[PDB]
Design an enzyme around this catalytic site. Structure first.
Site, short mmCIF file in Angstrom:
data_model
loop_
_atom_site.label_atom_id
_atom_site.label_comp_id
_atom_site.label_asym_id
_atom_site.label_seq_id
_atom_site.Cartn_x
_atom_site.Cartn_y
_atom_site.Cartn_z
N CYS A 1 2.37 3.32 -2.79
CA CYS A 1 1.68 1.88 -2.76
C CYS A 1 2.26 0.63 -2.01
O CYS A 1 2.28 1.19 -0.86
CB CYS A 1 1.88 1.52 -4.59
SG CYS A 1 0.60 2.09 -5.33
N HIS B 1 -5.52 0.97 -0.80
CA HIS B 1 -5.22 0.71 0.62
C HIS B 1 -3.94 -0.65 0.56
O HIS B 1 -4.54 -1.57 0.55
CB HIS B 1 -6.08 0.67 1.83
CG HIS B 1 -5.66 1.00 2.99
ND1 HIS B 1 -6.36 0.61 4.13
CD2 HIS B 1 -4.84 2.01 3.44
CE1 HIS B 1 -5.83 1.12 5.29
NE2 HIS B 1 -4.84 1.79 4.89
N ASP C 1 -0.18 -0.20 9.24
CA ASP C 1 -0.79 0.56 8.31
C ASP C 1 -0.03 2.03 8.45
O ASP C 1 -0.56 2.96 9.21
CB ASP C 1 -2.50 0.84 8.68
CG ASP C 1 -3.02 1.36 7.54
OD1 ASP C 1 -2.62 1.70 6.63
OD2 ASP C 1 -4.32 1.78 7.81
#
Lengths: 14, 331
Positions: free
Chosen positions: B12, B253, B270
């Protein structure tokens, strides 16, 4: 967690 | 020239948080100085943070966080999804703060992340008032009904009326009507601001995301909300990191944007892919109204050079480097 008149979370779980 | 973190499990916000803590250079240098020589790597969270930071510094390959998750015991699938980003930060920062106790870098965690706050309850009818002072390492701000971060801070320091069925018990003075409020005494050099992006219903046990538009500025003046202002150190802060969650529920995301040098050179982190990005993609594209920010990191302009101080390979102790290097060889 509680704040003002409701329960909130960041990232969304309680 | 910044390396990313492997996706691995459903960590997460952890990967977003780890990069944020890693690029707090003053924290990173103190973390390297922690005396983990005798720590067993199984349950040593301070040592695991050193391993993650070291790999984030000397690895072209993506950096793994498997050992770190075992260190603080978030191994179950729902562990991160039953928790919060500020809760994870406390677990990491409290463990390293205890480790630095009795060392040259003792008090590094309170110095960077801790501020002073005043909470008061003044009875309107009688001459009664309590003025408790509580320290804080993070601030949770309300976005529901607020347009920008200024209104969130206005609502944060706004007075609450303790009337009707929720009057304040003054003891010998008796139950009376009062006002409850919070004021800021000090603001930490590194300011962790989490946004209340979700509302929870106790009756139906459902979490609802608030994707409403919430504005945060590149430069944040907070001298107004201080109880007493200080010339030669105004409470002006610079945006350092923007932690973003694109999903519509817990899990989805999680992505963080940073300008590690404070120069305005923003990059998108990312997981495995660290790509240079626009200021536009960092600040305004995450205002909301799928992607929107849930946590912001601000650094005081006076402490900008010291907090984001240059870190060299010589800063990392050779003992720790050799211990980490030895483990890589054994693998």
């Amino acid at each position: 967690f509680y704040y003002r008149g409701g329960w909130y979370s960041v990232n969304g779980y309680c | 020239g910044y390396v990313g973190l492997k996706n691995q499990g459903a960590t997460c916000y952890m990967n977003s948080l780890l990069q944020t803590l890693f690029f707090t250079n003053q924290l990173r240098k103190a973390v390297y100085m922690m005396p983990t020589e005798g720590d067993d790597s199984s349950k040593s969270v301070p040592l695991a943070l050193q391993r993650v930071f070291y790999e984030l510094q000397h690895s072209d390959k993506p950096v793994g966080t498997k050992k770190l998750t075992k260190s603080f015991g978030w191994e179950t699938l729902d562990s991160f999804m039953q928790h919060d980003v500020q809760e994870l930060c406390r677990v990491l920062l409290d463990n390293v703060e205890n480790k630095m106790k009795g060392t040259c870098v003792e008090g590094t965690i309170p110095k960077l992340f801790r501020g002073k706050m005043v909470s008061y309850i003044q009875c309107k009818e009688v001459d009664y008032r309590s003025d408790r002072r509580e320290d804080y390492y993070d601030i949770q701000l309300s976005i529901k009904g607020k347009k920008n971060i200024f209104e969130s801070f206005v609502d944060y320091v706004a007075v609450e009326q303790l009337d009707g069925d929720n009057k304040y018990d003054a003891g010998e003075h008796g139950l009376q009507e009062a006002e409850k409020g919070v004021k800021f005494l000090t603001l930490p050099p590194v300011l962790h601001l989490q946004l209340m992006r979700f509302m929870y219903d106790p009756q139906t046990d459902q979490n609802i995301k608030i994707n409403d538009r919430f504005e945060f500025p590149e430069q944040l003046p907070l001298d107004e909300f201080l109880q007493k202002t200080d010339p030669k150190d105004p409470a002006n802060y610079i945006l350092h990191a923007v932690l973003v969650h694109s999903g519509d529920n817990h899990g989805g995301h999680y992505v963080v944007y940073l300008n590690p040098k404070g120069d305005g050179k923003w990059c998108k982190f990312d997981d495995d892919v660290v790509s240079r990005c626009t200021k536009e993609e960092a600040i305004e594209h995450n205002y909301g109204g799928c992607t929107n920010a849930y946590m912001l990191v601000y650094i005081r302009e006076s402490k900008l050079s010291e907090v984001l101080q240059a870190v060299t390979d010589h800063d990392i102790p050779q003992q720790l480097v050799e211990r980490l290097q030895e483990e890589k060889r054994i693998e």
